[model samples]
Target chain A: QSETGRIEAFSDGVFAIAITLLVLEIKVPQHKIVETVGLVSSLLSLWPSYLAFLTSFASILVMWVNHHRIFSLVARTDHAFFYWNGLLLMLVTFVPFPTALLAEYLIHPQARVAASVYAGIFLAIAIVFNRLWKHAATDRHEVDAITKQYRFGPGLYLVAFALSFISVWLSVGVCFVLAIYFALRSNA
Target chain B: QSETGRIEAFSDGVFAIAITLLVLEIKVPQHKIVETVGLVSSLLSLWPSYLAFLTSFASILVMWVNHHRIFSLVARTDHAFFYWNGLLLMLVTFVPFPTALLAEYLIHPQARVAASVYAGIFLAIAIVFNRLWKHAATDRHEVDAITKQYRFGPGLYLVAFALSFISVWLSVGVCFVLAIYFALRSNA
Candidate 1:
């Protein structure tokens, strides 16, 4: 049986890189364009990018923390666990795409679709988390108790997804609130 | 004493994310371009992106392996060791920028400049790796013996840098060779 340690290590790597790469999406204003638009206005023009960056970064950070907490309760792993973990990571790697989409279209007519896509991806992750946790919690680990107490993640993603059609900003706001809740929520 | 485990975990996250993000640089061809260029030609046109992705991915993979090998020898950490490790990670995180630059400019006259910048970043990382390894090798860990036997990294980076002034492809070739060397280098 494979120990939980190496998987956690590999997962952590994916989390770290994805979060760090978010900053690359924010391009710097420079050269002759700086003089034309003025530095402040040019910087301000990227508000959507900034918003998308913070939202994704916060969500990814919370995901990493949660992953660490869950792994702390896991003692061993098997083939299924590995694939489930990989499935979760697949979405994590895909975050940048939707983040880019939201940033690019947040001011355009497609903003709602972009937001819907973003929230839908998170919904998928929450569902995957539910599956991965159920499989790995074969020991009925203590983390299961914490997660079972309030399964806010999937529900929040659903709300966010529904709200996307109403208003993209509202959907993104829901995501931000969930991120904050996950960040502050404790196992104790 | 501060253990090296967490640091390695964090570093692995950065490596994984960076390597995976390289794929995002390869955009899918869409729209009228589909008819004008067709799918096969569109794919063929992205050869530079594919090359950059493979080169960066291979290098990052080797870096992760080497980092794992190095940490196996370190039992603990210090303030200096932590920051030195962070310094190395900073470059790891910044790699996608140059990789993007290389892909975008690979056929342009500025390709040399892009390649120089790419190779230069690796040179900086190689230097930082030397510092981090030296600082963390207080026990003269077994991994150090393996690394010390040839000390090829910094030298390879230097060669990559020098070659950039001559040929962009040649410089990238040097980087690829270094990646292979590091990957095949014996741990025994």
Candidate 2:
């Protein structure tokens, strides 16, 4: 509904680009480095990396859907919308860093810390996403509707944050589940 | 002028994100591995990387400007525009490979080859850019106007393409100049 079509064009590419960048961090096993393990087991060892990529890619997809859906509801924009959107993108670009960290440290002693950082980024994005929606909405009802939908985002990410301290798999699994729910939520 | 606001929004972010990704390839000097030289000298050794980043960034900027300028003139869109734009982005994403190649090999025996690859990407993009415009334009005059403006692009990039054989610096320099010219032209 927004006349600011320009904003939407920028947002779509940012999301898609971020998703592709996720794949770059997922490395293939080379015989040169896996001196001990066979190629098959070496490949299998990247399971955590594959899981981490799924979590980030799905999370990015959910954000992209939420962004597109909001622009559908937003009838117009102002200067603040630009800055809010810019910050949103800044966070999106940072996703790959945590994604790489999670992949590298997923099974290490630092797994919990890695998961915590991953969940923490999702938490930050949730808050920023809420703020972006709040700044662009017109009536109280519109803002309230967005609030009702996205309130789960912050709370769920916090849950993921806590789960990180307990189990890395549990944390990433929760992230995957949340991503699916939000994407489906926006699809309708 | 195009009513396809969604397309434009996607394209802008693709361009901007691609530009930012160029920065990630630049290395910062760290004393951790400086083994011999001071951090300052270590940083100085990355001059090729910095120049490569600038060249890639400016080239991306020029493409962004041309894309926006064309969209401003384009009255509508079609399925082909979507696909062509997709191809354009695919190429943009590939820019960093040659960029990194150039930086690492600028003074090596591989300098000419590296410069060729870098210049070659621009050549590919020039053709894709022209095709994207060809697919999206209206009447003869608009296309003619685009041709007049962009005919220099292929020729200039080929000039860059050949300059690679002589000097890596010459190729990169032409790239920088062409980027500046195209950006200023699109601004008007």
Candidate 3:
């Protein structure tokens, strides 16, 4: 009964920390390096890191808000709930790793590799994220609408994954839009 | 009246996030780095980062567990509580920044600078941390044991700051020792 509070407490910490660390990965050009790149454009060239940072933040924020809503509906947790949540949280924490990758490779020939990996992990997280909700679902009619959301995450991320081949920006763009979709649509 | 939960929730997120991010600072050696540095030495060279990471985790952990304990005692919050808690929490989030510095400089000529800055933030956090508890202290004698613990943080960090001049390890050692002191000695 009391465990849900502790669980959310831990998960929330992971969420905020992961989101905050996204900024740190945006390395500043050193003095000489900045000299070479020029000022305005030097700052301008950091768009990949900036957009990567914003996308990751949006992803984490929406997930956190959704988690907060779910926990309010969920008053109790079990051993299974603990591990599933742990797995989901670990994947959430790994966002910065792939985020850093996308930033580094966004302008490179390896852009597909980075974009695919990014979409891959996003898809992976969505599965586990949905899994937790699946397990948490009461199978009660009142929650059926929310249960339908389980498919939405994996489905959208799959679209991102597939689009990673066509247009990397399109893939990332979909991921960004997905955040807004879930935020307004998440069950309160 | 209901604001305390929100405050603790936000603070707990910051605490967890900061602590978790400490590990990412411990960069893994690249393949050639592994080759030239030798495997064992390569891993060994990471000792500073590992130690720095552990020290931060311990510090954040003790603080978080303590915050959890305090919120149990406190059932309400006000505007001041929000900002004070926010201030303290932001300072805690900054632990990773100083932590990365100390790790980078721990084996360098500027060891003292890194150690002192590390000590400085810890001392700064201790004061704000104490300020929060001081504000929350009911002036009731029953909670005096916990209130007395507040002085221990700043005082110990002060010792670390002074120690940074003579020996960097000595300063970090004190910090490591301080974690245990607070963990066992906290209000909980």
lDDT of 1 by residue, A1-188 (tens): 12467768777777777888788767687678989879999889889999889989988987887788778865677656766776687678767767876776677655786788789888998888888877865645455566763376788789999999999889989988888777788432
Q: Which pairs clash in the backbone of model 3?
A: A17-B17
Candidate 3 local lDDT, A1-188, one digit each (tens): 45677878687777877888888889886788788878778788888989889888888888888778777676777556655775677567667767876886677554775687788888998898788877875336546766678776798899999999898888888878877787778744
Q: Counting only residues 3 or more apart in sequence or on different chains, how many pairs clash (N, Cα, C under 3 Å) in candidate 2? A: 5
lDDT of each: 0.76, 0.76, 0.77
Best by TM-score: 2
Of models 1 and 3, which has the larger lDDT? 3
State the weakest 10-residue window (summed lDDT) of model 1 chain A. A141-150
Query: How close to the true structure is residue B33 of candidate 1, measured as C-alpha lDDT?
Result: 62
Q: Which candidate gets the maximum lDDT versus the true structure?
A: 3
Better of 1 and 2 by TM-score: 2
| Model 3: lDDT of residue B67 | 78
Question: Each model's DockQ?
Answer: 0.18, 0.12, 0.16
| Displacement of the residue A62 alpha carbon in candidate 3, Å | 22
On the 0 to 100 scale, the lDDT of residue A99 in model 1 is 83
